[PDB]
Design an enzyme around this catalytic site. Structure first.
Site, mmCIF file in Angstrom:
data_model
loop_
_atom_site.group_PDB
_atom_site.id
_atom_site.type_symbol
_atom_site.label_atom_id
_atom_site.label_comp_id
_atom_site.label_asym_id
_atom_site.label_seq_id
_atom_site.Cartn_x
_atom_site.Cartn_y
_atom_site.Cartn_z
ATOM 1 N N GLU F 155 0.843 -1.181 0.000
ATOM 2 C CA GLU F 155 0.000 0.000 0.000
ATOM 3 C C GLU F 155 0.873 1.223 0.000
ATOM 4 O O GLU F 155 1.401 1.611 1.016
ATOM 5 C CB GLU F 155 -0.937 -0.004 1.197
ATOM 6 N N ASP F 156 1.079 1.783 -1.174
ATOM 7 C CA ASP F 156 1.693 3.080 -1.449
ATOM 8 C C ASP F 156 3.041 3.248 -0.752
ATOM 9 O O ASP F 156 3.377 4.332 -0.278
ATOM 10 C CB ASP F 156 0.753 4.215 -1.045
ATOM 11 N N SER F 157 3.821 2.180 -0.680
ATOM 12 C CA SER F 157 5.184 2.248 -0.180
ATOM 13 C C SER F 157 6.151 1.954 -1.318
ATOM 14 O O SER F 157 5.750 1.528 -2.402
ATOM 15 C CB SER F 157 5.395 1.274 0.978
ATOM 16 N N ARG F 326 -5.536 5.062 -9.343
ATOM 17 C CA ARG F 326 -5.151 6.459 -9.478
ATOM 18 C C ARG F 326 -5.211 6.913 -10.929
ATOM 19 O O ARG F 326 -5.571 8.060 -11.203
ATOM 20 C CB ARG F 326 -3.751 6.664 -8.911
#
Ligand SMILES: [Mg+2]
Ligand SMILES: [Zn+2]
Ligand SMILES: [Zn+2]
Ligand SMILES: [Zn+2]
Lengths: 49, 259, 46, 52, 67, 428, 98, 505, 115
Positions: F155-157, F326
């Site tokens: 998650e978005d790392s 996104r």
RNA sequence: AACCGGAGAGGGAACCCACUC
């Protein structure tokens, strides 16, 4: 003597008006700095429109 | 149940890189050798920096960092040195470090380029990579009136600690150039360009599948940063891995016989 | 004891005393940078 | 304490060659703030050597 | 600021190529020609010289605090 | 053509924009007059004989990309992204660390962040020249692989190359400055800089005062840490009580320079600047020019990272799951164009609405350099050596390091200070 | 001293009525990155109350075309109120109509 | 009603798939600050007497020692050797250590699954690290989110948190009798690809995967294929992960409706009916509908039939073993995944042109008074309705065409089918058509007098003149479409800020 | 301030043992080997060599956590053969294999130079 | 020939900017 008005950098009444890049580097000033801000108590202030 | 016999042949030998091929060995052994190349070959680089004066435009840690990355020619000294943590000497000694000095002052009106040539070593053999038209590594530029003086010490270390102890610039590694084992699956094999080592006509895109194949003919291209000779990097890596396994063997044997 | 400072304008090294009004003896200026320390400084090259 | 505030050098172990300042000292060990890194560690007095 | 000593990705020494790269760009080599004239084949190393900006020259324009 | 010819030689003929206005070629239009005007988006493409739409155009636009602002004019391919991502990048561009001004060493300012090795983007828009971005840039052209490698990026790392960081990748330095003004504020009460003495000073911290000079100030080049005396200031007690300024707790830096002067009131005045080098660590917040923010999750050495046939190991690995929700296609196009530009030697052009460049042309160009035309490559597992079954998208992308470090946010408490009105723990 | 106060605190008006005077004018110049400095010097503020439930003023209007950047606004509680200026936008300075 | 509290910490969070769902990783600096008061007893007098001896310098030490008197001896400032002696009534404030119970929350606490208990594990660097399945209840994102940690200070409240608010004890919410945690992000996608019919594992790859099962009995199962060479299957290993003797029936996301009616009902050609029987995966492909948070999923039944402890192990085992297989499989997304066959581009272009022509002739009918108002609707309303109908139909048709054009290897499809991220409309928007931009439900309004922009003719009701975007995010947007898209996104961005002030109240 | 020292990845403290042996109780003739301060470089080659042994029923390796520096090797052997002797035989064959490779490599490098 | 430690001060109001949603 009425008072003293704070003056805007790089404006027509600033000491840096019309100076060349070499002169600004002599004064420890950035030629790329756009000015347009006031200095008050040694802190920059920008009048938001 | 026993070791297989591998073979080596070198296809290119240069002062800069070695390109070679290994046959009849496991994928794991090939990958581990590729791994030891980068991480676990001992080399010499400057790690201790004491600055006596610095009037330049870069701060002290910025210069000490750049200094750390300068490669030093350490071909035979690195074998006879010792890790600083292992030397019984209380203070720096010639058997566990190499001392460097640098005193440069800019006096004339021309900009002075402090490069690696200005590093004065203590040993005649351990020097920067510019030993023997090309320029040298640029450390800093000094204006008239600025100067820097500093004293440095070089120790032995490998990549695992810091990347400055990494001897190799680029380790290309390949096996099975034409997709015979098909460990990778191309959705459209036509779009994929042929490898350098591939052996196929312009018409055929990939080799036919064979279920009985195993990875062999590992292709290596080891390109040095200039500190160690490309050919001696591999010898040192093989010796280090063998010695690592030997130490584990001794410690296990000691443990079992004491168990 | 002596504690030499560096002038901000002409960059002359000069000595100035405890509670002495900050001046550069050669010029009409009052900004004085200190001098780099003399004790040992050691850095890792990491 | 006398040792507190005295610049010291580490002469033994992996931290060999590092300088530091003794923040808090005891008769057994001392807290040394290292010059090179932004970290303060604990080192026994036997490895320390007073400098200056 | 200043040219990095080593390429971040590869690790190849790229710190000594900056002055030669500028010299070749003076001589109407193009960048695509000057880069591989210096022996930089991997694009990871090529982007270092291609995208570097040298601000050390603007900093040297300022007078030193000392003399 | 004559106007362009005169303008192109402008350094020798002093033929400036004002002459262009005076010639009757361009006009200044405001909103009221823009209500009653007929605009043309591009002259060649909208003023031609065709199926007539309007035959009475009154004005034409110099270039559509001028509708953007300053922070929104650094996004490559902003028309290939969802509009909220553009807004996030506009906000996050103000926080990317770079060289904020050339004379940053003579400037005694609080909270300054400067990057070691800034780079101009490989993929640039034509409007970055007028913002001087290439002269004061704010990020690095890193090599990013969009792959799910070890689950530490999910998650978005992002996963980062430890060896790259060891070589100066995204390393920066942080300057903090302290001001002190001794003030004569009483009938007896005078502040004075001095080294406080244990027999004379009334009540002082446990911190050692040995780092100060007899002036009451530290010399530049002295190691300082939290709870250290930076300026030794005492006031006479009608023996004496100290008002010394301590280093900010956990700031943990090195004294950069010390300046002494007189304020406008004639009193002594001191400013002290302190360095601290910030090496990227896990928890530091990074971002791309498309609103793809994310913290570092773990750092693997060079040996651990996946590699191509050539020993190219990505500097940053980001998780593929960030893209489809996104819809930052501009990120993918930038990566492709960046690979083309690094190989070709040119600097890629990513102006918005430029009809001369698209994905097909970039793919054909990339096919000439021996790479898969869509940017995919074959990477090898770093641990086992076996080649990954899927092909990995990889290439150079411009990343920014934001100022939100983790060492500036972590704190805990266990019976520290207490408020004075209601006896509850303090805030902040 | 009056001008210095109004430009140092931001309260636009007499000091004696500091609550009545509108605040937020003359903020500290943002000096984190050159883009941040440039953007801060080109910023328009709507003097409408924040935390309001009327979303019509906050919406992007058609007439912003080519004069106000559509992408650039703060994402907090001031969405659509603080807005940055387009690259070629010029604000008239005024002149006599005689 | 609320106040500042002691013994609390706060820092940035980062993922760690190697922790259990009931563990949380904390930095040593935070652990060495926070303390817990242990009452001395003849059991722990020796352990605590060494801990006090270590002092506040070493991390596994003590900070304070509280005596029976309430006297508070501080160890971090030169403690005398005399008062380091301790008796059986004293309390020692030791540093937080491995296994301590803590409460963890993300500041927008909306439901009781926001403040849950965790077991502390000490890790080297400065961030809080928590397992990825616990992200869903906290609504965490690791994109810079901060979360804060409270430490129970007494034995009674410690036991109560352990017995009431532990994570594994909170798997099922009473809000909707569904599980709250589920497989999410890249495990979900890797599970769908791992459990497909044509997944075969050699002996070595199986032995590596079994190395990551905690609940394994050390018995290698008989391979599904013996002789040509021993090959296992993804299902054959996922059966070893499933605990106990669970029995449930689920259907995959791409299950055709007509398959059940006709033949092959119990022998699915598409491998699309999930059937787990006697704790063993027999057939089917696991997706969000099978391992997600929906009612009746495999984790829900696991929690209902087995204990919470066994369900906790189930979560941990799935993540570890599937993440280690994704190292071999790999999974990415690129610019090649957003491209079409050139056939589909022509089909999409023709559909758009037909829809645009249909809007033009509707406008022509409206201009000639040939449009009859819909009963219950006005002439303007029915014109708007008809135009919206045509444009929506065009977008749906183009999206379906783009969906059909996708191949089996496409990564957009891999993420949508498994339900890990994205939806079926995102693919159409990226590939086929962005669609129509709407403000307040209506089309883009006339903000200049009688037109949308100065580039348009007055009274232009066409699709291009009112906000319809006929380009894809791959082909880029025209400047007018770019501005209209900004107008659309601004509306959602505003509502996000406005909504909270009402929902919280 | 929480960053561990770089040398933490390969240096043993005082009292730590390089290799620890624990018998596995779940199944007969099974054992677990814990190696401190090692990574995939050593676990992978040991596991691959073990898989070549016809008398080894199971061989695997893992790293429990990347931030920690430890390896775990599980070895199961048929009942006539101890896992401990299987492990030592794999090591002593890998060492011989590497020594042979080095000798052939140096001979080839000598022949490359004017040969 | 003969003892020789040691703390305690920073609070509030207002404004602005930013962050996670
Ligand atoms: Mg978030
Ligand atoms: Zn020695
Ligand atoms: Zn002077
Ligand atoms: Zn490189």
């Amino acid at each position: 003597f009425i008072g003293k008005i704070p003056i805007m950098l790089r404006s027509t009444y600033c000491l840096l008006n019309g100076l060349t890049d070499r002169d600004l580097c002599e004064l420890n000033e950035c030629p790329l700095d756009p000015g347009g801000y006031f200095i008050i108590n040694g802190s920059e202030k920008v009048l938001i429109a | 149940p026993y070791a297989n016999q591998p073979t080596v042949r070198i296809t290119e030998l240069t002062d800069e890189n070695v390109k070679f091929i290994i046959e009849n060995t496991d994928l794991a052994v090939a990958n581990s050798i590729r791994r030891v190349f980068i991480a676990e070959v001992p080399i010499i680089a400057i790690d201790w920096v004491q600055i006596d004066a610095n009037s330049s435009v870069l701060h002290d840690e910025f210069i000490a960092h750049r200094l750390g990355l300068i490669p030093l020619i350490s071909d035979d000294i690195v074998d006879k040195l010792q890790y600083s943590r292992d030397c019984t000497c209380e203070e720096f000694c010639p058997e566990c470090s190499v001392e460097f000095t640098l005193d440069v002052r800019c006096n004339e009106d021309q900009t002075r380029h402090v490069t690696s040539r200005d590093l004065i070593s203590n040993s005649p053999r351990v020097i920067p990579v510019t030993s023997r038209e090309q320029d040298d590594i640029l450390i800093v530029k000094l204006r008239k009136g600025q100067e820097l003086r500093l004293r440095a010490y070089a120790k032995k270390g490998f990549g695992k600690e810091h990347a400055k102890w990494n001897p190799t610039a680029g380790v290309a590694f390949e096996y099975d150039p034409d997709n015979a084992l098909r460990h990778t699956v191309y959705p459209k094999p036509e779009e994929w360009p042929k490898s350098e080592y591939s052996e196929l006509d312009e018409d055929e895109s990939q080799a036919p599948y064979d279920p009985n194949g195993k990875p062999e003919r590992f292709y290596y291209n080891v390109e040095s940063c200039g500190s160690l000779r490309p050919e001696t990097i591999v010898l040192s890596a093989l010796s280090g891995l063998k010695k690592k396994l030997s130490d584990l063997q001794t410690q296990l044997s000691h443990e079992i016989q004491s168990d | 004891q002596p504690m030499i400072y560096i002038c901000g304008e002409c960059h002359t090294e000069n000595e100035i005393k405890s509670r002495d009004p900050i001046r550069c003896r050669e010029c009409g200026y009052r900004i004085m940078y200190k001098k780099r320390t003399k004790r040992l400084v050691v850095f890792d090259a990491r | 304490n006398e040792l507190i505030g005295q610049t010291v050098r580490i002469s033994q172990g992996p931290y060999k060659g590092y300088i530091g300042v003794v923040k808090d000292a005891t008769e057994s060990t001392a807290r040394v703030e290292l010059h090179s890194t932004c970290q303060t560690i604990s080192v026994d007095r036997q490895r320390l050597t007073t400098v200056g | 600021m200043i040219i990095p000593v080593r390429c971040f990705t590869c690790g190849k020494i790229v710190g000594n190529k900056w002055e030669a790269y500028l010299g070749l760009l003076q001589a109407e080599y193009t960048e695509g020609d000057a880069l591989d004239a210096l022996g930089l084949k991997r694009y990871c190393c090529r982007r270092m010289l291609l995208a570097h900006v040298d601000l050390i020259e603007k900093l040297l324009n300022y007078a030193p605090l000392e003399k | 053509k004559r106007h362009i010819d005169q303008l192109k030689e402008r350094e020798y003929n002093n033929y400036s924009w004002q002459d262009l206005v005076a010639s009757g070629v361009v006009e200044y239009i405001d909103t009221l007059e823009e209500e009653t005007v007929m605009l043309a988006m591009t002259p060649d493409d909208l003023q031609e004989k065709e199926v007539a739409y309007c035959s009475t155009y009154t004005h034409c636009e110099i270039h559509p990309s001028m509708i953007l602002g300053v922070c929104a004019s650094i996004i490559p391919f902003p028309d290939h992204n969802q509009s909220p991502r553009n807004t996030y990048q506009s906000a996050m561009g103000k926080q990317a660390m770079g060289v904020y001004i050339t004379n940053f060493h003579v400037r005694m300012d609080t909270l300054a962040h400067v990057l070691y090795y800034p780079q101009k983007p490989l993929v640039t828009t034509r409007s970055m020249e007028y913002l001087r971005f290439r002269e004061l840039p704010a990020g690095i052209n890193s090599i990013v692989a969009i792959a799910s490698y070890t689950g530490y990026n999910q998650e978005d790392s992002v996963i980062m190359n430890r060896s790259a960081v060891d070589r100066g990748f995204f390393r920066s330095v942080f300057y903090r400055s302290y001001k002190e003004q001794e003030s004569k504020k009483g009938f007896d009460q005078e502040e004075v800089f001095e080294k406080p003495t244990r027999e004379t000073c009334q009540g002082m911290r446990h911190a050692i005062y040995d780092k100060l000079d007899d002036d009451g100030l530290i010399a530049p080049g002295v190691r300082v840490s939290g709870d250290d005396v930076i300026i030794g200031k005492t006031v006479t007690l009608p023996t004496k009580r100290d008002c010394s300024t301590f280093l900010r707790t956990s700031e943990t830096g090195i004294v950069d320079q010390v300046m002494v002067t007189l304020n406008q009131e004639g009193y002594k005045f001191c400013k002290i600047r302190v360095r601290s080098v910030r090496i990227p660590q896990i928890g530091d917040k990074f971002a791309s020019r498309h609103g793809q923010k994310g913290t570092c999750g773990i750092q693997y050495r060079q040996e651990d990272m996946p590699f191509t046939c050539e020993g190219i190991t990505p500097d940053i690995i980001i998780n593929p799951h960030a893209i489809p929700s996104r819809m930052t296609i501009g990120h993918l196009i930038e990566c492709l164009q960046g690979k083309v530009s690094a190989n070709k030697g040119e600097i890629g052009d990513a102006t918005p609405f430029n009809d001369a460049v698209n994905v097909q042309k970039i793919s054909n160009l990339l096919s000439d350099y021996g790479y898969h035309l869509r940017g995919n490559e074959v990477l090898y597992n770093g641990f086992t050596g076996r080649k990954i079954t899927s092909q990995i998208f990889i290439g150079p992308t411009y990343y920014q390091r934001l100022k939100h470090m983790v060492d500036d946010k972590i704190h805990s408490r266990a019976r520290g200070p207490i408020q004075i009105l209601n006896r509850q723990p303090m805030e902040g | 001293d009056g001008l210095k106060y109004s430009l140092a605190t931001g309260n636009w008006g007499d000091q004696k009525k500091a609550h009545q005077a509108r605040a937020g004018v003359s903020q500290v110049l943002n000096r984190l990155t050159f883009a941040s400095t440039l953007s801060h010097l080109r910023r328009l503020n709507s003097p409408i109350g924040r935390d309001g439930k009327l979303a019509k003023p906050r919406q992007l209007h058609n007439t912003l075309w080519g004069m106000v950047c559509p992408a650039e606004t703060p994402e907090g509680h001031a969405v659509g109120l603080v807005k940055n200026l387009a690259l070629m936008a010029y604000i008239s300075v005024g002149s006599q109509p005689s | 009603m609320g106040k500042r509290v002691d013994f609390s910490a706060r820092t940035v969070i980062t993922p760690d798939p190697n922790l259990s769902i009931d563990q949380v990783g904390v930095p040593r600096s935070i652990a060495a600050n926070m303390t817990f008061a242990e009452i001395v007893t003849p059991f722990n007098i020796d352990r605590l007497q060494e801990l006090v001896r270590r002092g506040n310098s070493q991390y596994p030490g003590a900070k304070y020692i509280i005596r029976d008197n309430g006297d508070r001896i501080d160890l971090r400032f030169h403690p005398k050797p005399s008062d380091l002696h301790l008796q059986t009534g004293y309390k020692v404030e030791r540093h937080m250590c491995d296994g301590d119970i803590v409460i963890f929350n993300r500041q927008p606490t909306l439901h009781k699954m926001s403040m849950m208990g965790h077991r502390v594990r000490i890790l080297p660097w400065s961030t809080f690290r928590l397992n990825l399945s616990v992200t869903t209840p906290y609504n965490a994102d690791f994109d810079g989110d901060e979360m804060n940690l409270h430490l129970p200070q007494s034995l009674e409240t410690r036991a109560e948190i352990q017995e009431l608010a532990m994570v594994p004890r909170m798997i099922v919410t009473p809000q909707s009798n569904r599980p709250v945690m589920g497989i999410v992000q890249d495990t979900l996608t890797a599970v769908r690809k791992f459990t497909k019919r044509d997944v075969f594992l050699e002996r070595g790859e199986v032995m590596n995967l079994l190395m990551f099962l905690s609940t394994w009995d050390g018995k290698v199962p008989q391979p599904a294929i013996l002789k040509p060479r021993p090959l296992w299957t993804g299902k054959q290993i996922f059966s070893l992960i499933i605990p106990g003797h669970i029995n449930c029936i689920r259907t995959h996301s791409t299950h055709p409706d007509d398959e059940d009616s006709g033949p092959y009902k119990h022998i699915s050609p598409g491998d699309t009916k999930v059937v787990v029987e006697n704790g063993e995966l027999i057939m089917g492909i696991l997706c969000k509908k099978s391992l997600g948070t929906s009612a009746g999923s495999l984790v829900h039944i696991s929690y209902l039939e087995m204990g919470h402890d066994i369900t906790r192990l189930f979560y941990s085992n799935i993540q570890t073993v599937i993440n280690n297989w994704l190292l071999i499989e790999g999974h990415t997304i690129g610019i090649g995944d957003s491209i079409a066959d050139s056939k589909t581009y022509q089909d999409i272009q023709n559909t758009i042109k037909k829809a645009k022509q249909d809007v033009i002739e509707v406008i022509e009918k409206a201009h000639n008074n040939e449009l009859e108002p819909t009963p219950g609707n006005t002439l303007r309303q029915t014109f708007e309705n008809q135009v919206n109908r045509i444009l929506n139909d065009a977008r749906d048709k183009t999206g379906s065409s783009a969906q059909k054009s996708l191949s089996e290897y496409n990564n957009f499809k891999s993420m949508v089918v498994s339900g890990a991220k994205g939806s079926k409309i995102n693919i159409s928007q990226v590939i086929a058509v962005v669609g129509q931009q709407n403000v307040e439900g209506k089309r883009i309004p006339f903000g200049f007098k009688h037109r949308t922009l100065p580039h348009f003719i007055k009274d232009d009701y066409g699709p291009e003149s009112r906000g319809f975007v006929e380009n894809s995010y791959l082909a880029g947007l025209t400047p007018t479409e770019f501005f209209f898209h900004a107008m659309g996104g601004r509306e959602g961005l505003i509502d996000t800020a406005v909504k909270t002030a009402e929902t919280g109240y | 301030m929480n960053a561990p020292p770089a040398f933490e990845s390969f240096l043993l403290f005082e009292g730590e043992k390089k290799i620890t042996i624990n018998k596995d109780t779940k199944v007969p003739n099974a054992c677990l080997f814990t190696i401190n301060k090692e990574d995939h470089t050593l676990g992978n080659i040991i596991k691959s060599q073990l898989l070549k042994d016809p008398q080894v029923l199971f061989a695997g390796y893992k790293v429990p956590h990347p931030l920690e520096h430890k390896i775990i090797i599980r070895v199961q052997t048929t009942p006539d053969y101890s896992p401990q002797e299987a492990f030592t035989n794999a090591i002593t064959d890998l060492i011989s294999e590497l020594s042979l490779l080095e000798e052939r490599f140096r001979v080839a490098i000598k022949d490359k130079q004017e040969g």
